[PDB]
Ligand binder design. Sequence first.
Ligand SMILES: OC[C@H]1O[C@@H]2O[C@H]3[C@H](O)[C@@H](O)[C@@H](O[C@H]4[C@H](O)[C@@H](O)[C@@H](O[C@H]5[C@H](O)[C@@H](O)[C@@H](O[C@H]6[C@H](O)[C@@H](O)[C@@H](O[C@H]7[C@H](O)[C@@H](O)[C@@H](O[C@H]8[C@H](O)[C@@H](O)[C@@H](O[C@H]1[C@H](O)[C@H]2O)O[C@@H]8CO)O[C@@H]7CO)O[C@@H]6CO)O[C@@H]5CO)O[C@@H]4CO)O[C@@H]3CO
Length: 87
Amino acid sequence: ARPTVFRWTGGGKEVYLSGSFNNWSKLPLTRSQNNFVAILDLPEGEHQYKFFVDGQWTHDPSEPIVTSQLGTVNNIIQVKKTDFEVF
Ligand SMILES: OC[C@H]1O[C@@H]2O[C@H]3[C@H](O)[C@@H](O)[C@@H](O[C@H]4[C@H](O)[C@@H](O)[C@@H](O[C@H]5[C@H](O)[C@@H](O)[C@@H](O[C@H]6[C@H](O)[C@@H](O)[C@@H](O[C@H]7[C@H](O)[C@@H](O)[C@@H](O[C@H]8[C@H](O)[C@@H](O)[C@@H](O[C@H]1[C@H](O)[C@H]2O)O[C@@H]8CO)O[C@@H]7CO)O[C@@H]6CO)O[C@@H]5CO)O[C@@H]4CO)O[C@@H]3CO
């Protein structure tokens, strides 16, 4: 598993990260310089995720997206051979 950085740049007061890698629970993100951020160790390969921003499910329009089998929009990224890549 490689350290991987998630960064929400869309603002807000309170932000959670939800994705396949935490079974779609809600991880509190840390405010840092107008970002909200978290760092997770993730195995190489695909992950889907989304944000929960002041009470509302939101994706990041600047990362790739896909429609899930539930019929919802997630971000989709590919963890590769780099430590602390920012998504
Ligand atoms: O919780 C896990 C989950 O979280 C994230 O989803 C959130 C999402 O981003 C939000 O937008 C919001 O979703 C609401 C949405 O906006 C509304 O449209 C509505 O959803 C309706 C759909 O429009 C409509 O498609 C229909 O859905 C039916 C499906 O067509 C059908 O396929 C089936 O769904 C089942 C799947 O086939 C199955 O794979 C399994 O789903 C899993 C996913 O594959 C998986 O990615 C993950 O889902 C994430 C998700 O990707 C995030 O975006 O977890 C799933 C395991 O549970 O299970 C399905 C059976 O439940 O069934 C449904 C109908 O039963 O109907 C809905 C009307 O509800 O409502 C949304 C509010 O719930 O919220 C979610 C988090 O709640």
